UniProtKB/Swiss-Prot annotation, chain A:
Protein name, entry field: Albumin
Post-translational modification N6-succinyllysine, affected residues: K202, K433, K502
Effect of E379K: In Hiroshima-2
Gene name linked to the record: ALB
Post-translational modification: Glycated in diabetic patients.
Residues annotated as site: Not glycated: 1, 17, 38, 61, 70, 90, 103, 133, 156, 171, 178, 187, 192, 202, 209, 237, 259, 271, 283, 356, 369, 386, 399, 411, 429, 433, 463, 472, 497, 502, 507, 521, 524
Record organism: Homo sapiens
Gene Ontology annotations of biological process type: cellular response to calcium ion starvation; cellular response to starvation; negative regulation of mitochondrial depolarization
Length: 532, 581, 581
């Protein structure tokens, strides 16, 4: 059996080559485009050889061994990758896993300078395939964890925008608002997948699956528990593969999962028919973003089975995570108006209550009160979004950003300035995108997006660690990252800074961070005035 | 014991505040928004005071007394309410009941102005709380009998439309269709509640309960008669409270009733599962419009117990309204295809038959043929709906409305023109609403909606009566209102109105109006025309309607718009005056 | 008693005129628009006479006689229909039937020119009535079997598109997408109706009815068999009327059937509620395409009554087609994931099994293995669709079409070139329409559509037969036409066509054509290429196609358009003619 031949045939030549390009650009982010183009062609010709004759040389090797061997030939001979070549002394599995630390979440790369639209349209028509490879290359090397099947989807949307607008009357009026929209969606997609990987790889399979159970139970509340569980198992496989760089198997398995879902809408959701009529890449993307289904008509009494019953400890002790998973499933399918991190916070609270109360005498009188525990947990984010969005409906995004900017620079000023500017702007952006949504979607939007942004901070900071408290909030609890950051207090240990004499806001937001780093003990009134 | 604190606790702070806003908006319809806001906050703080110490001052007075006192202070001080302050000389219970005549079913209020969609969306985002308070306020003062818990539901749907649409690409394409459907729903809900109050308050508890029995037996035909009767009794308490202004008790009791129904759904209907998993406002609303359950499969013969048996009279004399209630329950649970007013008509026919035949020597030989009486009573509404729906399908709604305008202006030309236009437009909306259904659902939709619309006519007319025939059809019989109006013929004792030139003068404001707005203006003119020349034939009127239709199509595409309407309009007036003079 | 009067009153004047226009346009396809307008107005004036007085001259004649007389006046007098005058010597019923062969499935008519969108919007405003008649006329003459009630539906959607888009800022951006979607739906509707007529008229009542049982049982699987059969009976009456030209009765009966279905939806399907709330034309259309209901949850085992029972033969022998119809009904209601032609193939296999096994000593041992015969029958279309859809998803519609062109030109090269291009393009559109569905809906869509498109081939070929194998596949078995055509291997006995130079000389007007126009010109040449050298392989043919694409790219991006084509045309044909012989 030739694994490379198997995946080439499943995926077809064009998806194969693009996925292979993404795989090398995300691991070898400093190599030039033309180097990766030749590499892709070599791999693709090797693959076709293996389709013709699976016994041909190296065709029976694992994609894991083959990808690493290719990587190691580059990094061994070249000098730009001296650190990564240290992995190449290892055997599998240590060698593949050693590659992960060399994925650079903030690569030091020049900003893409943009030709004129008519120029780009000309280049687009002149060689469409080369135009799109260069798109895949520039994005992938800048977002080394970008979800690979979704990047294929983005490339498709990118091309369709050039197809449409390069025939426009005002080509720029058509193209530029599309590319800006496309760029915004992609940054969010990248940051979301980065948290999927971090949750699975750093916090473990159980955490990733609990999160998947909650979100899928919200999205498909009519689905039976066994069906939700099956979907969570497949997704775990897909994202383990993608997050460890096995992009061919990931894309291939994601295709199979989309097909399984579309062949079984009658057991999953009434909202899928239009998704399941689109071609593969759009189909998977649509399914990932489909609106919540309506609730079934036969929901059980949650308090009957999990709080008021007297044999809860006996059912829990027979199968602890199954029982907790049923609780999470029943709770999330009933509350599409909750954030996922809140449901998980609630499920964990329920879990601690059972561990505690089932040891005591008369556990039922102990655990019957767990719903009361939930009340302040539900209110604290409700109060936080309400507060901060009210400041947001007052102060515009730019202003709201400077608010958070000042707030977080006070909390952790040991953090490097560009990290603080970057995270604070994204924090502000959550206000922009979530505050005006329907209340049945406010908390899901606002708090789950904050988790995405804080993961960016945790990932940037784990590379160059500068704040013990950040390390603490980042690593102590996945679901409690947001409250841990909210509850951080003003730093008492950082020394002020000496005096140093519409792209403009970032230089402005730079100095405001450098101002708070200069006079840390001030409050907002003085900080507003110095920039005025 | 503090009622205000009790209702505050059952309802929650924001349901309390919204219901108090509704209650004062419906009784003091002319006071501006900002006065009511300051009045609601005062009540709310009073309520919390009573939540703390139920022995605090006034905290032990009944909500009935507190509302009247608060009303009367406002009415004795602020002017614009010197008639309502006459009520304030009276003690309870006369004081509260006296307020009812000052509920204005047609208040003279400025038309709601509409900013741009994106502008409305911005106002909605800037202060979503005040946005919705103004909504409650503007609706309640225009619909002083709007069912208060349903108004809270509409406010949620209204908030949902803005949250769903104010981030759309094309906000207006999203928001305007929803708001117009909501407006349709709201008007119908208002008019239905108005009939619930009028039937209970004007015709009596027994009339209200009988209607309730018929409708709930259709909807819950597997329910035991005793279960139907319990629901009918709780609904009577709920609507007595709402219709007399006790909106806090009304809302609290409606919530308890939805609770009871959901906890007892396996004794009531299988269609309730979805409703009973919903939040409270959605829950109650869902229950009120749930589809009819299926009939039992093991029913006896209705005729055996009520017609064929020879001792009907013995069972009737033991308990007359109970026996009539059982007949009505049996007939209605079997006939979801009958309008409620028809079923009530049949129960009344049966009652009259028993009262007459039970006095006879051989009663069974007198009442056994009662089904023969029923047959013409079923066929007349069947025929009426069939023929009018065929007309509606030929004309579309706007022209069906115009056919009804002429018909009703001829029947009762003494009625005011805006009331004639209002009522006739709604009668045509019955066509749009009900004719689309197959014949099984057609009659319940069409005849009960007709009844709802004729009640609107009766309420506006009772205030300013101008026609004896209208007063007669309105008051002689609740359930026979529709046939009585259906059988009114042309008034031949009507003096045609004298010509008024400005009445038939049109201006380019026509072209600058939305469809609805231009329609009403043409319809207003069409009623005035018929009033000026009542003996004008259908084809004479179609002739003037063609001339005008061309007239406005030409003068809206006219180089100079206003001068066209003036120039060609006088040629139309003269041409029509001569064609009908 | 006057048939023309009865249908006039049932249909109303507007439906009646439109249907008469369609009837004459479909039988007299070469007569100009204004002739038909005059003819319809005279027929319409006669019908109104008959409504007013059913004894008036000619009012008691049959529609057949009246229609055929009017037809025969034009044909025997106006030298345009010389052949059609032959029918006119006959009497009814032979005269009316004789007309059918002169229905031209591919009339020789210039393509419709399209004015500018704003010009069309103007014409539509100025005389909507004439605009719509011209639409009905041009479609009906080009599609002489278009289902007449559905063409009324399409005209209403056509009007709504103009009503909406002609008040749009960018009229063309709104309207051209809608017109393109209506055209694609319309072409599919026409081809579907042509198979309904061909299956009924050529293959008989029993074949049409069995197909109808299968499709309605899939769609209405809760309905009782008696209810399915009633629907099938009525549908047989409807389509017999439409397919033989009796459009007034067909439309009248179809509306009665839609009414019957909507009055009895609780005996038929839970999915009909929304369809049954629409106006008549939308209602009938909606019902025709409503989604399949859910199967009952209390079905018995089909195998028990039809396979495992040991006295199948006794029950079959008592009532053979009823027993086979029950089988089909049971199998089809359980298998919405099977095409109708597969279900019919399975029923025919079951029928052959009973005929063979019921003569055996132990019939049960013989027919109890019938499910083993079904397995390869199910597998082959599943396999064929899976593979072809993968090819489609790797090529897209245009390339898929071109691949099918090569395959089918090799299969039946005697078939004319415009026919091969028409049929191959439509076969590729089956990929676009059906391959996007999950596999549970893929087979019904793809294989029944494949059958629709092959009937197009069969219908054009029956007129001008050039291939015995096409005639064999078209006439051997209705339900097996698709496997028969799928299994056709390359014609190894075809004599290649000579070389014609200007068949392969392309000119500058290529770049001046729309997307569909260039493809068809390119595809016409690709067929002629395969006819020139039927031995070449797809890679050899892709090569000649490859540089040809470049040839049109550069020569259209050229200073003098025509010059590059003429110059580089010689070299292209030269190297291609060298590359292949
Ligand atoms: C908008 C909320 C932020 C996104 C959440 C990201 C990470 C959560 C971690 C676990 C994900 C595992 C299941 C993947 C489900 C895909 C749906 C989605 O795309 O969610
Ligand atoms: C289309 C139906 C017409 C509505 C009838 C309106 C008024 C009915 C009069 C008396 C009803 C009193 C009982 C209340 C039942 C509520 C059901 C409903 O919501 O009706
Ligand atoms: C996509 C499948 C198309 C197949 C239809 C074509 C031919 C069918 C032959 C038999 C006609 C009898 C059924 C008539 C009603 C079916 C409605 C429909 O089917 O519209
Ligand atoms: C402008 C080039 C094309 C971008 C438009 C589609 C981009 C899809 C992927 C989004 C990521 C964009 C890269 C941003 C660089 C960065 O944030 O570091
Ligand atoms: C400013 C425009 C927004 C208001 C839209 C109305 C919301 C629908 C609520 C329905 C209740 C009854 C409305 C009828 C009003 C009237 O007749 O004056
Ligand atoms: C782009 C041309 C639009 C013509 C009018 C659109 C309405 C579609 C009517 C569908 C009937 C079948 C149309 C196909 C006509 C043909 O094949 O020549
Ligand atoms: C009385 C005749 C049969 C009663 C109703 C049956 C409906 C259609 C009849 C045709 C029978 C076709 C069933 C088998 C299909 C086949 O073998 O072709
Ligand atoms: N995390 C922020 C709160 C916040 C920032 N941006 C937001 C956007 C929406 C809601 C809340 C927020 C804090 O520490 O308080
Ligand atoms: N009440 C009307 C009939 C009518 C008006 N609107 C309707 C809607 C549907 C059915 C009947 C009607 C009359 O008797 O003149
Ligand atoms: N009839 C074709 C198969 C085919 C053509 N178009 C299709 C679309 C979908 C599925 C199959 C097909 C063949 O056997 O050669
Ligand atoms: C899918 C297995 C996960 C168990 C869910 C428990 C929630 C948790 O406490 O994190
Ligand atoms: C020489 C073959 C290299 C295969 C690259 C596969 C990339 C991956 O999915 O890990
Ligand atoms: C519950 C009391 C209602 C009485 C029903 C009898 C109907 C009638 O004759 O009016
Ligand atoms: C000052 C207190 C007024 C009480 C308001 C209660 C409203 C009502 O339900 O009648
Ligand atoms: C002059 C008589 C013409 C009758 C038209 C009937 C059309 C059709 O055949 O249904």
């Amino acid at each position: 059996k030739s694994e490379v031949a198997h995946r080439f045939k499943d995926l077809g030549e064009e998806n194969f080559k693009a996925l292979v390009l993404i795989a090398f650009a995300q691991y070898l982010q400093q190599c030039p485009f033309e180097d990766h183009v030749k590499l892709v062609n070599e791999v693709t010709e090797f693959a076709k050889t293996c389709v013709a004759d699976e016994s041909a040389e190296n065709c029976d090797k694992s994609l894991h061994t083959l990808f690493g061997d290719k990587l190691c030939t580059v990094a061994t001979l070249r000098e730009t990758y001296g650190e990564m070549a240290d992995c190449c002394a290892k055997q599998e599995p240590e060698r593949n896993e050693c590659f992960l630390q060399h994925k650079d979440d903030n690569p030091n790369l020049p900003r893409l300078v943009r030709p004129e639209v008519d120029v780009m349209c000309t280049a687009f028509h002149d060689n469409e395939e080369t135009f799109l490879k260069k798109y895949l290359y520039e994005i992938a090397r800048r977002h080394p964890y970008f979800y690979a099947p979704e990047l294929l989807f983005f490339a498709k949307r990118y091309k369709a925008a050039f197809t449409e607008c390069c025939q426009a009357a005002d080509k720029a009026a058509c193209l530029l608002p599309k590319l800006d929209e496309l760029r915004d969606e992609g940054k969010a997609s990248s940051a979301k997948q980065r948290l999927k990987c971090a949750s699975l790889q750093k916090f473990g399979e159980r955490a990733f699956k609990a999160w998947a159970v909650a979100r899928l139970s919200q999205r498909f509340p009519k689905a039976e528990f066994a069906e939700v569980s099956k979907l969570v198992t497949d997704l775990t496989k897909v994202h383990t593969e993608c997050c460890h760089g096995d992009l061919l198997e990931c894309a291939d398995d994601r295709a199979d999962l989309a097909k399984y879902i579309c062949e079984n809408q009658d057991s999953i959701s009434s909202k899928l028919k239009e998704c399941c009529e689109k071609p593969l890449l759009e189909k998977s993307h649509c399914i990932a973003e489909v609106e919540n289904d309506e609730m079934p008509a036969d929901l059980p009494s949650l308090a009957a089975d999990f709080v008021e019953s007297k044999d809860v400890c006996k059912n829990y002790a027979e199968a602890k995570d199954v029982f907790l998973g049923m609780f999470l499933y029943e709770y999330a399918r009933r509350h599409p108006d909750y954030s996922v991190v809140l449901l998980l916070r609630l499920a964990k609270t329920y879990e601690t209550t059972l561990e505690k109360c089932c040891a005591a005498a008369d556990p039922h009188e102990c655990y019957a009160k767990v719903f009361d525990e939930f009340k302040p947990l539900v209110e604290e984010p409700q109060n936080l979004i309400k507060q901060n969005c009210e400041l947001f409906e007052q102060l515009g995004e730019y202003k709201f950003q400077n608010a958070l900017l000042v707030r977080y620079t006070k909390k952790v000023p040991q953090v490097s300035t560009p990290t603080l500017v970057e995270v604070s702007r994204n924090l502000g952006k959550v206000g922009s995108k979530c505050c005006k949504h329907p209340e049945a979607k406010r908390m899901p939007c606002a708090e789950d997006y904050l988790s995405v942004v804080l993961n960016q901070l945790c990932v940037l900071h784990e590379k160059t660690p500068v704040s013990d408290r950040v390390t603490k909030c980042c690593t102590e609890s996945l679901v409690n990252r947001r409250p841990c950051f909210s509850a951080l207090e003003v730093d008492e240990t950082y020394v002020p800074k000496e005096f140093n004499a519409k792209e403009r806001q970032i230089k402005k937001q730079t100095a405001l961070v450098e101002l708070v780093k200069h006079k840390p003990k001030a409050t907002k009134e003085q900080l507003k005035a110095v920039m005025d």
